[PDB]
């Protein structure tokens with residue numbers, strides 16, 4: 001039903017998902033001058049050494065690299081978080097042009113794409129329960145800008161031809177998500193939501209200040225994916241991003257001065 005077209009895009013979502021106009025919606029613009037340094041915020045703990053990737057899926061909205069989340073194998077802790085959050089999947093949002101594609105913006109700047117590493121709070125037992133809680137998920141967001149290639153992204157780029165259309169999946173074992181991280185773990189954080197329907201207000205957002213660089217050839221391959229299923233009219237999977245939503249009664253905190 002919902003998507004990113006003129007007739008089913010972000011401006012329409014509220015009709016089926018009234019929380020779209022809620023009090024803690026994502027993404028948002030990060031006004032860097034208004035964000036306040038919070039000296040009490042802990043360093044982020046990204047522990048991905050035991051990660052078990054399984055599969056890559058074109059779900060018609062993006063592609064997800066899925067992980068075994070039946071044990072503490074790849075976890076996010078520290079920062080603004082209380083407890084342990086398990087990595088379940090990552091995906092990206094990207095544009096049709098290098099000048100757009102990110103969901104979060106920084107002083108109104110749009111990046112070419114944005115990576116979301118999605119984690120759920122163990123305390124809640126599984127992902128489905130976690131999305132029903134205001135602190136159920138932690139999403140680590142990383143901006144992508146076009147420049148030098150990201151070597152750790154290439155394995156993802158090269159499998160995309162095998163999942164061109166909605167509903168296609170491929171084996172995707174032994175992928176190391178540490179190869180997608182920038183050098184610095186400096187971040188902004190705020191309480192928000194899923195950025196796609198059902199738009200549930202269950203996410204602690206942690207957005208890294210340092211973007212990663214990917215090559216023009218790498219993002220061009222993202223843009224060859226299809227929203228449609230096999231044997232349907234081709235619609236390129238591009239501009240699968242929700243624009244910035246009102247900040248309302250929220251403060252964005254910075255881990256760094």
Ligand SMILES: NS(=O)(=O)c1ccc(-n2cc(CNC(=S)Nc3ccc(-c4c5ccc(=O)cc-5oc5cc(O)ccc45)c(C(=O)O)c3)nn2)cc1
Pocket residue numbers: 116118127128129131132139193194195196197198200
């Ligand atoms: N871009 S992003 O922000 O990083 C992002 C965006 C979307 C997802 N995403 C979206 C999905 C789709 N799967 C979902 S939403 N699962 C799910 C799980 C539980 C419920 C749910 C219930 C499920 C079963 C049930 O018996 C009762 C339920 O009661 C609820 C009450 C709530 O307040 C909220 C959610 C539920 C629902 C849902 O119905 O929305 C959907 N999976 N991952 C992940 C990350």
Ligand SMILES: [Zn+2]
Pocket residue numbers: 091092093116195
């Ligand atoms: Zn996302």
